[PDB]
Amino acid sequence: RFLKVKNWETDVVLTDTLHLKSTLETGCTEHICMGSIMLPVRTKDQLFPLAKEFLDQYYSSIKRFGSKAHMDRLEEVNKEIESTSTYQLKDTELIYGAKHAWRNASRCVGRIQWSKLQVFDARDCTTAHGMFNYICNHVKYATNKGNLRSAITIFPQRTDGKHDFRVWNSQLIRYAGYKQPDGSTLGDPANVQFTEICIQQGWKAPRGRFDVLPLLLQANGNDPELFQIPPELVLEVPIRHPKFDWFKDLGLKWYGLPAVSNMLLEIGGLEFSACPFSGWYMGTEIGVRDYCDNSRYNILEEVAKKMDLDMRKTSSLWKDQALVEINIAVLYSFQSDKVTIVDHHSATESFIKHMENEYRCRGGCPADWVWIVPPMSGSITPVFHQEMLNYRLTPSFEYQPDPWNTHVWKG
Amino acid sequence: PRFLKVKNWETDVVLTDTLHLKSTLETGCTEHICMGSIMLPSVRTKDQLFPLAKEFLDQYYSSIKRFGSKAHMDRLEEVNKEIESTSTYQLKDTELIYGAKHAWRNASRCVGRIQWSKLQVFDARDCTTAHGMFNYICNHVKYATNKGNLRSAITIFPQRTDGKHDFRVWNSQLIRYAGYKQPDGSTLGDPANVQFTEICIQQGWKAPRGRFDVLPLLLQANGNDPELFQIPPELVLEVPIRHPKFDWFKDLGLKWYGLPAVSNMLLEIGGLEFSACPFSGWYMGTEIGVRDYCDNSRYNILEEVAKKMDLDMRKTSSLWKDQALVEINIAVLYSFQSDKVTIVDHHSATESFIKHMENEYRCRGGCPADWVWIVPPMSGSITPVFHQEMLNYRLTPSFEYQPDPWNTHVWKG
Numbered sequence A: 001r002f003l004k005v006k007n008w009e010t011d012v013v014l015t016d017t018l019h020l021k022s023t024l025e026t027g028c029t030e031h032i033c034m035g036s037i038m039l040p041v042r043t044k045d046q047l048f049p050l051a052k053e054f055l056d057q058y059y060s061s062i063k064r065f066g067s068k069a070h071m072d073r074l075e076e077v078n079k080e081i082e083s084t085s086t087y088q089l090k091d092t093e094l095i096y097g098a099k100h101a102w103r104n105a106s107r108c109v110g111r112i113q114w115s116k117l118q119v120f121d122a123r124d125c126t127t128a129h130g131m132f133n134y135i136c137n138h139v140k141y142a143t144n145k146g147n148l149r150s151a152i153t154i155f156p157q158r159t160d161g162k163h164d165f166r167v168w169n170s171q172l173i174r175y176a177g178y179k180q181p182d183g184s185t186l187g188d189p190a191n192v193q194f195t196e197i198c199i200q201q202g203w204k205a206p207r208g209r210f211d212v213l214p215l216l217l218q219a220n221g222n223d224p225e226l227f228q229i230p231p232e233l234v235l236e237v238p239i240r241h242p243k244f245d246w247f248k249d250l251g252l253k254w255y256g257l258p259a260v261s262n263m264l265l266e267i268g269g270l271e272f273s274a275c276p277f278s279g280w281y282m283g284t285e286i287g288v289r290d291y292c293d294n295s296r297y298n299i300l301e302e303v304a305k306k307m308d309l310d311m312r313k314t315s316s317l318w319k320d321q322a323l324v325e326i327n328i329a330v331l332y333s334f335q336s337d338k339v340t341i342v343d344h345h346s347a348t349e350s351f352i353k354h355m356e357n358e359y360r361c362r363g364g365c366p367a368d369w370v371w372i373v374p375p376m377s378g379s380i381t382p383v384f385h386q387e388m389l390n391y392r393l394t395p396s397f398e399y400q401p402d403p404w405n406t407h408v409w410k411g
Numbered sequence B: 001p002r003f004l005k006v007k008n009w010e011t012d013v014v015l016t017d018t019l020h021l022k023s024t025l026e027t028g029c030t031e032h033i034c035m036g037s038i039m040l041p042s043v044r045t046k047d048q049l050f051p052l053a054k055e056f057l058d059q060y061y062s063s064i065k066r067f068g069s070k071a072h073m074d075r076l077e078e079v080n081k082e083i084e085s086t087s088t089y090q091l092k093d094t095e096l097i098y099g100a101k102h103a104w105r106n107a108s109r110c111v112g113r114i115q116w117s118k119l120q121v122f123d124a125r126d127c128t129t130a131h132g133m134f135n136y137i138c139n140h141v142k143y144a145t146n147k148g149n150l151r152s153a154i155t156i157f158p159q160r161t162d163g164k165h166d167f168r169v170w171n172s173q174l175i176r177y178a179g180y181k182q183p184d185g186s187t188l189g190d191p192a193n194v195q196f197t198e199i200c201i202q203q204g205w206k207a208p209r210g211r212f213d214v215l216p217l218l219l220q221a222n223g224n225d226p227e228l229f230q231i232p233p234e235l236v237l238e239v240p241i242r243h244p245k246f247d248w249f250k251d252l253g254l255k256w257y258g259l260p261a262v263s264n265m266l267l268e269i270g271g272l273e274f275s276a277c278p279f280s281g282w283y284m285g286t287e288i289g290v291r292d293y294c295d296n297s298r299y300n301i302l303e304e305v306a307k308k309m310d311l312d313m314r315k316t317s318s319l320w321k322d323q324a325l326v327e328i329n330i331a332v333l334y335s336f337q338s339d340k341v342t343i344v345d346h347h348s349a350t351e352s353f354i355k356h357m358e359n360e361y362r363c364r365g366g367c368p369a370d371w372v373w374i375v376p377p378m379s380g381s382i383t384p385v386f387h388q389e390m391l392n393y394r395l396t397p398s399f400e401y402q403p404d405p406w407n408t409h410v411w412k413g
């Protein structure tokens, strides 16, 4: 039951007891490990145990476990589910829940910051125009002129499943992708489907390479509506290299604010289907993945050519050399414009310190090694040498289907 | 479940695994916890042994298209009677070869498996003494080295009987460098081998006490106390490491050996346990250039290289570690290629592996693979394996960990 994890660099061993609190499942079995697979309404009876589980942890956290206040609240919530088939979180509960969903996020390397999350309560929102206003305020607060601050905005919880709030966008800020007559993709290929959805809904696409997508927002189960984020709220950084003057001529830029907007927040059985959240970038996210994935901007060959590397044979490591340079450029560009960014060395070192804190004060830290180890220079970061246990605690952030696959278009 | 899909996220190819239904052994994972990043998670009686033997011979006979034949049926009968009367059994030479090839085929952590069908198997089951093991191992080294044109090979010593007469190679690899803890707390040579080096010295080895001393072989035959032997220097091929552009690189004084030969694993075939089964292929460059040279708890050369490169080391965000890492790895590949010693870069190796894996799904129904081990320790996502979902499970015949023998050996004195 009590599991040990070893760091093979430092020989430090930690003991995990926290995994014994996971109710949810991993996709693995005793015979098969699915650790590398990307993706392996509640009835009344379903809901009270989940609410109770949550309220017990909440009341424990504030040192009032078993108190009258604790028991009073369970009964109140119990009576509310019984009567209304659902319930409403107190503001203190919502804030605790969202922070803990971040705390429990096994794939997030930035969790040392978890207790500092700014939670914006948008549960009073009723319309798409209201959603747009809440989202601009989030973008402006979080961006903070380049001195980024973590934040989440929480729209109304699911009820009957036919009045869901959703941000159709996968992040608040992303670039369009356009399939071309000549077979190629212009822009970001990751966003081709969603861009088409915007167009057929009305968007007049500019048809460039770095077109900030419009917001497509769904309130109360209604058909979604298009809105443009004030251009002046979208902070971008042009990418240059401190040594190569030709780099700026590649014409590359990226946006400062990473804001995942397609996930579902579960707190105490309640489901928050629209819950955009933001932090700040780790450099490799943009320089390794967004820029060098073959299926993304796929820029390695172009960069390698401008560096005049020998690209006749893989064993010259021309791909590897170009990769480091692209990532050097990304960090230098964000730092020079005073936009918060963390490099993979600093971020992984912080995470190892966070793990140790969590093991000491909480009995463990769920971590997905496949996601925590950066996509370049893996073994020269400390996380590579750290064994991790992956398990699922709630409150949690969950994947959910894209809404265009399930939306019944009212028309 | 009968069908499991894996997806490649860069190509959108989906593959269907059915081979996992033949998995027997357990992973360490459960419905509630994944242990996929744990390095090591968690004799046989007659009753245990016959099904394991039968399972294996059905696999063997099926492979040669003689399943259910009289040949097949007689062999089952023969093994059953052999187990009944002697409590163990002996493999035919053909079955041993098949078994050893399949253990490699089945090794989830090995990126080199496109080569599995070409293993040279050396049958050393007539061996009885440590001196005999030494001679077998010298022959393996000379054959596998092949003057730099490396050939994959495995030498198989007698199987376990009662667990009191085990053959063991105490070395973790046939060729490895000594490590010495100094009184000031520093390490001379390879810190990975300090404990084994101390054991060798205790048993009588006169250590040169340098930075790259080839360790002696420490060999246990038939449960007896192990004995020391020096591999003839002329059979140990080494490569001095230089850089194609940086002429100061050579003056770091680095070299490595050409033949990687894991010697501490256990090979299971049809329930039988082969506790001494050294095997060798050829290096992928990152094993040396990233791990052996640049791990903090190994030779740890990153700073020295970066200093000589005049990189800005004041802040991690210059990516000075990363820039130095690439150059060290360019140097390892350049040096081996220049001396005409087989080596493979991590791009070539991972590309070959994806082709192998796809072929295996199609002809075999699956390819168990450990993503944590398969993805190289630098430049992960610019290799195709990073983007490939994998399924990890345990098929037999198999290579398994076993505890270091100094922890278990009963000293006879």
Ligand code: HEM
Binding pocket: A098, A101, A102, A105, A107, A108, A109, A110, A111, A113, A117, A150, A151, A152, A260, A277, A278, A279, A280, A281, A282, A285, A342, A347, A371, A397
């Ligand atoms: C504050 C700075 C933050 C940093 C440096 C950071 C770092 C990261 C990185 C590098 C990833 C991998 C992303 C990818 O590969 O696509 C990730 C994933 C994730 N993070 Fe964070 N993060 C931060 C803030 C947050 C916040 C504020 C939340 C929630 C409140 C959060 C929750 C998550 C979740 C759920 C994932 C997995 C997302 C997925 O499955 O696609 N993170 N984080």
Ligand code: HEM
Binding pocket: B100, B103, B104, B107, B109, B110, B111, B112, B113, B115, B119, B152, B153, B154, B279, B280, B281, B282, B283, B284, B287, B344, B349, B373, B399
């Ligand atoms: C012929 C060329 C080969 C290449 C390029 C290759 C490549 C590799 C690499 C890079 C690793 C990771 C090693 C580490 O990180 O320490 C590995 C692991 C492994 N390989 Fe191979 N290999 C080859 C031959 C072989 C052979 C001949 C066998 C057995 C007959 C084999 C079986 C294994 C096993 C069992 C592991 C896991 C070892 C462990 O857990 O420490 N490989 N291979």
Ligand SMILES: C[C@H](O)[C@H](O)[C@H]1CNc2nc(N)[nH]c(=O)c2N1
Binding pocket: A036, A037, A038, A370, A371, A372, B009, B386, B387, B388, B389, B390
């Ligand atoms: C197939 C494999 O799961 C996939 O490529 C994963 C690998 N590790 C990851 N790690 C992070 N942080 N983000 C990702 O998108 C990926 N994708």
Ligand SMILES: C[C@H](O)[C@H](O)[C@H]1CNc2nc(N)[nH]c(=O)c2N1
Binding pocket: A008, A384, A385, A386, A387, A388, B037, B038, B039, B372, B373, B374
């Ligand atoms: C903790 C983690 O499992 C450990 O550092 C693993 C990571 N992946 C690996 N991959 C390979 N090929 N070899 C290794 O030794 C490691 N070690």
Ligand SMILES: N=C(NO)NCCC[C@H](N)C(=O)O
Binding pocket: A258, A259, A260, A278, A279, A280, A281, A282, A285, A286, A289, A290
């Ligand atoms: N650092 C964060 N969030 O705080 N990342 C969110 C996912 C962003 C995604 N990896 C990208 O490169 O666009």
Ligand SMILES: N=C(NO)NCCC[C@H](N)C(=O)O
Binding pocket: B112, B173, B260, B261, B262, B280, B281, B282, B283, B284, B287, B288, B291, B292
């Ligand atoms: N490629 C192989 N075998 O053929 N590797 C075996 C392990 C070698 C180990 N990684 C080292 O760097 O010494």
Ligand SMILES: [Zn+2]
Binding pocket: A028, A032, A033, A034, A035, B029, B033, B034, B035, B036
């Ligand atoms: Zn698993």
